[PDB]
Design an enzyme around this catalytic site. Structure first.
Site, PDB file in Angstrom:
ATOM      1  N   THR A  25      61.316  61.431  35.897  1.00 11.71           N
ATOM      2  CA  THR A  25      60.107  61.821  36.610  1.00 11.71           C
ATOM      3  C   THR A  25      60.024  61.221  38.009  1.00 11.71           C
ATOM      4  O   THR A  25      60.601  60.167  38.281  1.00 11.71           O
ATOM      5  CB  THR A  25      58.853  61.405  35.821  1.00 11.71           C
ATOM      6  OG1 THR A  25      58.863  59.988  35.621  1.00 11.71           O
ATOM      7  CG2 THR A  25      58.828  62.095  34.469  1.00 11.71           C
ATOM      8  N   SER A  26      59.301  61.897  38.895  1.00 12.10           N
ATOM      9  CA  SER A  26      59.147  61.417  40.261  1.00 12.10           C
ATOM     10  C   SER A  26      58.385  60.095  40.254  1.00 12.10           C
ATOM     11  O   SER A  26      57.596  59.821  39.344  1.00 12.10           O
ATOM     12  CB  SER A  26      58.405  62.453  41.109  1.00 12.10           C
ATOM     13  OG  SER A  26      57.104  62.694  40.604  1.00 12.10           O
TER      14      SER A  26
ATOM     15  N   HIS B  43      63.960  54.004  39.359  1.00 20.89           N
ATOM     16  CA  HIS B  43      63.817  53.767  37.933  1.00 20.89           C
ATOM     17  C   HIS B  43      64.995  52.850  37.640  1.00 20.89           C
ATOM     18  O   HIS B  43      65.950  52.799  38.416  1.00 20.89           O
ATOM     19  CB  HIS B  43      63.994  55.060  37.130  1.00 20.89           C
ATOM     20  CG  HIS B  43      62.882  56.046  37.302  1.00 20.89           C
ATOM     21  ND1 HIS B  43      61.562  55.729  37.062  1.00 20.89           N
ATOM     22  CD2 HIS B  43      62.896  57.356  37.643  1.00 20.89           C
ATOM     23  CE1 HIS B  43      60.812  56.801  37.245  1.00 20.89           C
ATOM     24  NE2 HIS B  43      61.598  57.803  37.597  1.00 20.89           N
ATOM     25  N   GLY B  44      64.941  52.130  36.528  1.00 20.32           N
ATOM     26  CA  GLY B  44      66.046  51.258  36.190  1.00 20.32           C
ATOM     27  C   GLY B  44      65.967  50.722  34.780  1.00 20.32           C
ATOM     28  O   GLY B  44      65.009  50.979  34.054  1.00 20.32           O
TER      29      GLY B  44
ATOM     30  N   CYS C 175      62.485  48.991  36.240  1.00 21.37           N
ATOM     31  CA  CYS C 175      62.355  48.433  34.896  1.00 21.37           C
ATOM     32  C   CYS C 175      63.609  47.645  34.558  1.00 21.37           C
ATOM     33  O   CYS C 175      64.667  47.858  35.156  1.00 21.37           O
ATOM     34  CB  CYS C 175      62.173  49.541  33.849  1.00 21.37           C
ATOM     35  SG  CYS C 175      60.564  50.370  33.891  1.00 21.37           S
TER      36      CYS C 175
END
Lengths: 103, 146, 103, 146
Positions: free
Chosen positions: D34-35, D93-94, D135
């Site tokens: 997701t954006s 993101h991560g 994350c």
């Protein structure tokens, strides 16, 4: 300004807050110990605490430990694979304030 | 009174706090782990160093994984109200996120969880220090000439 | 005193030395971001840098960031699973000296 | 001259150094990610903050895993001789040890290795800062009332 995630009426802190992990080595690496004098990290940590605990904030003391281990030590081994290796301690801080052992 | 900043932890409680040292030198043959020569030198150095900082140093040698967890659980259940902080030093073989008891591994997370802000209320808001002498993997640093 | 692992003729440092990782959250945890104002960590990091970069050493600045995120923020979510959660940034230092953005 | 201590990094080189910001807001549908609404606010805040610290800020938006590695490799091969330090900010993101490109993950280790003391000589002995907003797992902190 206002938002949905700030200034809660009931003050709370993370359950993981106020922890400090002083690792002897970088993530994924071996840690070295002299069979006679002890580990490079503990040797250095004690030396820096004895010299600076009544003068410097804890993170700065640990930074001196990082420098001492990184510059002064290099492994010796009859096995070429483990010979002439280096080590850099790793300070992991989730502390929320400065820490001085004295007051 | 005058301006108050609260930028440093309150370290003037009656006691500085506990300094628990777990010194694992000899491991069970069953594990195939080798003895850690020189670790006693570290243990003694730490006892003297933290003694001079006024910590209540308690040492334990060659603890099994069960004994490590029991020690941590017991200590976390003590009343640390009059103590400024908490220190735990782990001396043993290890891998990323793991510290070895004399008969097997112990997740560092299991050890530190006992001291979470919600699980050890008398230490909430106080610094909890974990000093770890152990491997975190099998990579070697070749270093670079300066 | 003398030993096999100290005072090398050729000075070397670890190849992993002098790195600093300023993580937004603790190992193994989610990291929070406000869809409108940005991430709690970056918001706080910029605020502390703007206010203290010409006054404090970097680790102390990051410690203030840790405190800001830990105390001021708490998640809001229609999903109870992700509601009212906290976050504590994680400073990982393999630096060997103090760092000041000014001189 | 007088006593020299060398307790702080030399930060008076001609240039403070680069501040590379990788801002990933939109991801390929193929990944199902997701954006990241609000990330542009972070990116802009960082540009202004580091600009005032005199860093050469360079921003990049929505980079693929290949582009992230190429950017890091290229930057690491520049001559940082006149620069005091190096800064890289990753916004995406991560997961633990991973940062996501718009089309897949990138090991943080692969990114930082380009700057190792032996691989980027013009940065040897100089602070290399990596600021990571992502994350590191799926655990949630319930917090504790104070």
């Amino acid at each position: 300004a206002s938002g949905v995630d700030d200034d809660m009426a009931c003050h709370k802190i993370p359950v993981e807050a106020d922890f400090l992990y002083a690792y002897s080595t970088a993530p994924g690496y071996y840690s070295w110990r002299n069979s006679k004098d002890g580990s490079w990290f503990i040797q250095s940590l004690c030396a820096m605490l004895k010299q600076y605990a009544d003068k410097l904030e804890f993170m700065h003391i640990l930074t001196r430990v990082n420098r001492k281990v990184a510059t002064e030590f290099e492994s010796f081994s009859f096995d070429a694979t483990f010979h002439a290796k280096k080590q850099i301690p790793c300070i992991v801080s989730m502390l929320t304030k400065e820490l001085y052992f004295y007051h | 009174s005058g301006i108050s900043l609260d930028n440093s932890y309150k370290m003037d409680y009656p006691e500085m706090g506990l300094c628990i040292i777990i010194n694992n030198k000899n491991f069970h043959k069953s594990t195939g782990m080798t003895s850690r020569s020189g670790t006693d030198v570290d243990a003694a150095n730490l006892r003297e160093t933290f003694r001079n900082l006024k910590y209540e140093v308690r040492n334990k040698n060659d603890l099994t994984r069960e004994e490590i967890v029991e020690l941590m659980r017991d200590v976390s259940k003590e009343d640390h109200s009059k103590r400024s902080s908490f220190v735990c030093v782990l001396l043993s073989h290890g891998e990323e996120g793991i510290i070895f008891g004399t008969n097997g591994p112990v997740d560092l997370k299991k050890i530190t969880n006992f001291f979470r802000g919600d699980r050890c209320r008398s230490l909430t808001g106080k610094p909890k220090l974990f000093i770890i002498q152990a491997c975190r993997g099998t990579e070697l640093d070749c270093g670079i000439e300066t």
